[PDB]
Amino acid sequence: ILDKKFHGILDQGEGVLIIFDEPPVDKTYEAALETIQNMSKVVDSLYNKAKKLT
Amino acid sequence: NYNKAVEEEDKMTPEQLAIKNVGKQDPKRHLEEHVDVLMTSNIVQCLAAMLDTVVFK
């Protein structure tokens, strides 16, 4: 459980030593990966912004 | 899927945005079907989340 894994988290008082998980949560993942690059696109538009006025 | 997979190519083009006004040639909008499809989608499904309070009491 330390080195390797099967999502076998320890409970000293259940019996089943419960393995439960939700793998597909990519809804938030791909949007976060978008926002990471979108902030860069805003930064790379800020040059045009701060340059075209004055 | 239908939103995000189109959204990364919607955000590609500010790499290529620049100045010298006519010296660049590729103006295309990118906000299409991510304003309105998401609007209709999320508003109708939050009213679908309202169905339980509307029907049930």
Add this chain to the structure above:
Amino acid sequence: AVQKVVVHPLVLLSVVDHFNRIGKVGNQKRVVGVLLGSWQKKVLDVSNSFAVPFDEDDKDDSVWFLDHDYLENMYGMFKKVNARERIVGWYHTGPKLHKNDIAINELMKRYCPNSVLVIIDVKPKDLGLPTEAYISVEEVHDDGTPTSKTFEHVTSEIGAEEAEEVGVEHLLRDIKDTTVGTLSQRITNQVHGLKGLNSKLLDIRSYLEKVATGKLPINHQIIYQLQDVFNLLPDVSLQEFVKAFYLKTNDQMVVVYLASLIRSVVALHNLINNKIANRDAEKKEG
């Protein structure tokens, strides 16, 4: 015996024109005409129909007249020019049935052994779908009466067929296609709340009919049992859904996550082109 129907509006307009044919003459009661059909599965289809003359005095609702010779002649016509069709029933324009209708039904159930009627309304305002289906079978009775031959309300709809709306949606011209995103949901809210709970309140008006009246078939067989199918939720006060507020939060969960993330990205959509083109137009306007 009949699963449901698939009924095109063309046969309804074929009722409408004969309604025009009778609105100009001495109209005693209503229209009784032939309903052809395309019966394939236990489901039903109608492509076309035609009428038959009819009068009815009201002394013992037995004086009522058709022309089976004319009926079978024009049936032979439309059967020759189209071997798909056959008769499947009849129709009437007065929205409330009467006791002669069983004599009509069983007198035309001799050609084909089923003859489903169609209630319609030439001036419909309050109803839902005009198309209605009965069938004449027997359950005989709990008291097992001598032949309690009952019309049995079969489910119905308006049918659908490819490119039959070529005339229709060109004619009506007023359709706001795809109002998803605006006010269609609240039209359904007003009409389903009010116009379904008034059906409910007229059901409880029929319950008051069972209170002050209603000895007749008081009907303690199907009424409370399908109302027990309703009474799967006895929604009394204290509201009893402590075991469903977290499920409602789970309902709120994903959609509000989508709302937060996506509409932040929607502000991110608008601002970029809005700022850039905004100050473009602003300080390159002169």
Add this chain to the structure above:
Amino acid sequence: LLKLFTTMELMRWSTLVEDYGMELRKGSLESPATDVFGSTEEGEKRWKDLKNRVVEHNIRIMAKYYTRITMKRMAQLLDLSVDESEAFLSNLVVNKTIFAKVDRLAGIINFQRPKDPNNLLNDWSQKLNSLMSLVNKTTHLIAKEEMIHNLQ
């Protein structure tokens, strides 16, 4: 035999000892009851298979049923005690095709095996069934109301 198989409902092992051990002395046929039960070197292995039958008779319907019962209550409704429960249920959790639920924590178990991955069929069942029954409520309650005012 068939009553032990139609919906099965529980069984007592000692009533089976009665009904199918008075057949090992009562004779009409005597050789198949010998070969299955009266024998020892294989017939007693078939008695062990009968013990498999009584415990799977438990486990099949208790996999069909029993959401939120305890454990000593479970063993006394198994008609076999808690150490016999760990024996008689280990040798059918090696079947490893029935998912059940036990805890100790003082000697108390619980249930509802899939941990409820549902907010979906709640909406499906509840709302689609109820709303379509309610759109039937118009089409047939006002039908019967119009019928009872045809006959009035």
